[PDB]
Design a protein around this ligand. Structure first.
Ligand SMILES: CC(C)(COP(=O)(O)OP(=O)(O)OC[C@H]1O[C@@H](n2cnc3c(N)ncnc32)[C@H](O)[C@@H]1OP(=O)(O)O)[C@@H](O)C(=O)NCCC(=O)NCCS
Lengths: 274, 156, 274, 184
């Protein structure tokens, strides 16, 4: 410390961190101090723009990020991660272990339609095929279109959180071509079945690719790198962490005991004598 | 035709291999020679993706891009006129043969010890056809004080 | 399913879930539908009020929750959980494993001054002792006052994110007695040392206890149960998850390799021959 | 419970579990009771054979599994997961959070050469190419051969835990072609 204070020794540093300078008189985010964060009146969408993308996003994009964090919050306790959080909270653990045990299920089958339903529609829209050929291309390979379909809310019965997002992206949001492509795929698929509508997990994916590559601030190789590194898994994980912490606090407030999972739901199929 | 001024204070290099010690010695030589810009523009290591390596310019820290293919290294850097080939004895021939069809590389330095003599004869004949100056195989390099230093020549 | 559809069999249910009815035509939060969530213009603080407390918080309390999530975001990569997230991201894992490996350090030493700095000041304020006796009571036992002290920003040099929060709680926020108690402890401790100011991890704790027990909606046994179950660990974890996901995306965008931690920082002190 | 005790209602079950019947008078593993586990004198390699593969492995394979668990134990605190466990333990957490925060780094770069160095050599040995063509095939694509190379222990200086394993697989272990391919 004395030889580096007077600067006569040189050490290569790790951990290059283009994010959050904690040193100095103020907490600087991406390049913006915390007093400018609260003075420019950017919310949680603004600080996600600063911490995740290192960019000052426009005021509609921050509000869209907040809206996506509000709809990707809890979706009931039946789903896989909420189930794991509740099984963990009833084993009496703590908030971090419960949230964490539920967060470690956001993979491909649960919570991974955000990123896959954007990679698929982006690889279809940038290859340059019309939607009526994309549906039939995904019809000759297996592999259903990620981000299409609901169990209940179909058509003449919309999902009403796909709709709030969709009328946000139609109004406050210039030049949205991939959502128009996804709505044309929706027009084609709702002729096959009544219940083949855009998911919320597909509309947030395609509207977030439109948010990245269609506003300012991103060229097209920043906008594709953020879609390939995984900044859409982060939207689902940060949104669903509110619901999982709410589920933990709920099972601690109802004071429920350890869960045991009854034996007549299991059907042991063990070998004869190994 | 072969050049007569191989190295200068505006000479930029591309290093073939993961040779951060030699590149750091070259940058230290450039800083103690009061030079404006680093000698190394890029590195070429085929066994990993395109990233950046962290090096030192005096006290300041800079980044040097490590490319995977040599064509990507030549497209981003047209001012590079020397390649330093730190390949092994069994893969310096292919690297030099793939180097010599780029017209921007005016001189090549081969470091490897034990390239078999028919292969280096073919390297000599294609260098004489193309007009590039190979600093010969099994060398430490060459040092022009004030301008440029090839790899690990001189030492520390 | 047929015997329960026509209702002739009865099964006791587990998982009592006083949160997020996913069944039906709309996603209901606490008791409020998602269209009412976006129509009443409540942000992420409003949906934390709905999911975590099952209460419609007033419009200043939701904005204070958002402000606390904005200041409990990233605090640089040196700190313990950000370090673990970066070591995980450089091992090439995925977003959930990196975020999770950094989130599983928010315990007592890192990130646990939110809940401890509120339990301590609440157990001191509700016991009915003046601050000048509380400081000396915590002076005869060891155990420093949690939520007091900064390394650098002291006095005539304020912390400037303690200050934005503190001037939010002074303006938009009626009847704040525990923050006044903590500021009297601050007046007493800044006479001892220059750098014994309120932390952000102590001011959010005491201002959140004032938010719970001092606005509407909570009586005093709901407000103490939410402070004892752990709803203040959730504020730090949900705030710091933005910074940890930003650190993961940062180390994936800088494309850094596996970390190895050099041997001359370790000092092996092994036994002789066991 | 009363309508299913007298058996007049049928429910489809989830969680099909071909492992560890906990019901009954004894803990049965794969198909073998726990008294037979301790009576047949199978160790931790035997119960990994029962729980993971549902098979009674021979007595050399169980001892090889135990030997692999003994060499894939600690490798110093510098490495990535041990580092995360220590950063977690110094934050004062608990055993499960510390172990877990270090375990969630065993991916592809740290701890994933076990599975990749077997998939690669198996895809090379079952494609039917000689080793002298496999090395040059992995020389024209980038992508170094996983499971080859040490930074210190080289040759005339062996690794001495590769050697204990290697002389276990040479002695107690019939018909080992992929290890012979890897040694070529
Ligand atoms: C640079 C120099 C050291 C050669 O490097 P090297 O010791 O062969 O090490 P490299 O990384 O270059 O190559 C190692 C070889 O092992 C192989 N290898 C490396 N890692 C591997 C892995 N994980 N799996 C399989 N193979 C691997 C590589 O393929 C390479 O051979 P290749 O030519 O087929 O690529 C040599 O030029 C030198 O000594 N430098 C100074 C020059 C000099 O002083 N000589 C002149 C007179 S002294």
């Amino acid at each position: 410390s004395w030889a580096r204070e007077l600067g006569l020794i040189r050490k290569p540093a790790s951990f290059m961190t283009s994010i959050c300078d904690e040193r100095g008189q103020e907490l600087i985010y991406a390049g913006m101090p915390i007093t400018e964060v609260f003075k420019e009146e950017m919310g949680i969408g603004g600080v996600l723009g600063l911490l995740w993308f290192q960019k000052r996003l426009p005021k509609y994009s921050c509000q869209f990020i907040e809206m996506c964090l509000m709809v990707t919050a809890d979706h009931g306790p039946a789903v896989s991660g909420a189930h794991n959080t509740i099984i963990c909270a009833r084993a009496g653990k703590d908030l971090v272990s419960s949230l964490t045990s539920g967060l470690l299920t956001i993979g491909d089958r649960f919570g991974g339609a955000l990123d896959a339903a954007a990679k698929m529609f982006s690889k279809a829209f940038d290859s340059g095929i019309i939607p009526m050929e994309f549906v039939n291309k995904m019809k000759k390979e297996g592999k259903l279109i990620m981000g299409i379909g609901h169990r209940v809310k179909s058509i003449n019965n919309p999902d009403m959180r796909v709709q709030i997002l969709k009328d946000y992206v139609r109004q406050h949001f210039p030049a949205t071509p991939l959502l128009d492509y996804a709505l044309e795929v929706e027009k084609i698929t709702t002729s096959k079945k009544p219940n083949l509508i855009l998911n919320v997990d597909g509309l947030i994916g395609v509207a977030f690719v439109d948010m990245l590559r269609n506003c300012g601030s991103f060229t097209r190789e920043e906008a594709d790198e953020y879609i390939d590194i995984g900044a859409l898994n982060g939207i689902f994980v940060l949104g669903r962490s509110m619901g999982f912490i709410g589920h933990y606090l709920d099972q601690k407030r109802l004071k429920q005991g350890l869960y045991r999972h009854p034996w007549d739901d299991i059907s042991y199929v063990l070998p004869e004598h190994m | 035709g072969k050049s007569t001024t191989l190295f200068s204070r505006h000479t930029k290099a591309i290093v073939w291999g993961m040779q951060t010690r030699a590149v750091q010695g070259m940058l230290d030589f450039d800083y103690v020679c009061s030079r404006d810009e680093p000698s190394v523009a890029a590195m070429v290591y085929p066994f990993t993706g395109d990233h950046k390596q962290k090096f030192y310019w005096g006290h300041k820290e800079i980044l040097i891009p490590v490319f995977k293919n040599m064509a990507d290294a030549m497209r981003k850097h047209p001012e590079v006129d020397v390649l330093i080939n730190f390949a092994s004895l069994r893969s310096a021939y292919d690297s030099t043969m793939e180097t010599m069809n780029y017209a921007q590389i005016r001189t090549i330095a081969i470091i490897a010890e034990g390239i078999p003599e028919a292969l280096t004869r073919k390297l000599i004949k294609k260098a004489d056809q193309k007009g590039v100056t190979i600093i010969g195989p099994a060398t430490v390099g060459g040092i022009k004080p004030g301008c440029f230093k090839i790899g690990n020549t001189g030492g520390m």
